[PDB]
Amino acid sequence: GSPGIHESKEWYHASLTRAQAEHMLMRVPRDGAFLVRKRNEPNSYAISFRAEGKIKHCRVQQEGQTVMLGNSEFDSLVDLISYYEKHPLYRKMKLRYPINEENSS
């Protein structure tokens, strides 16, 4: 029907102040939560993810025909997160914190 290597939902917010995203992740009391978002330009996105008592937005760029995740060029933002669900991102966090809290699972 309408599945895809994109589309879907709940992991990329396209509209909010670049600094209000720090207050939405600061309002949530817990260690570990990853999300993605769109900057104020269609030439770069950003992974908003906090851990412990700190917040860590991340800036991903897009080349004319590919994407620069950070140290490698990936084929798309969905395949990026696909092998990234198993690999680390920064020196400690990953996509290991989906909806997380004592009342999640």
Partner: peptide
């Protein structure tokens, strides 16, 4: 400063 971190999985 903590408003963006380049996503690198350990410096190796």
């Amino acid at each position: 400063d903590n408003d963006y971190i380049i996503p690198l999985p350990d410096p190796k």
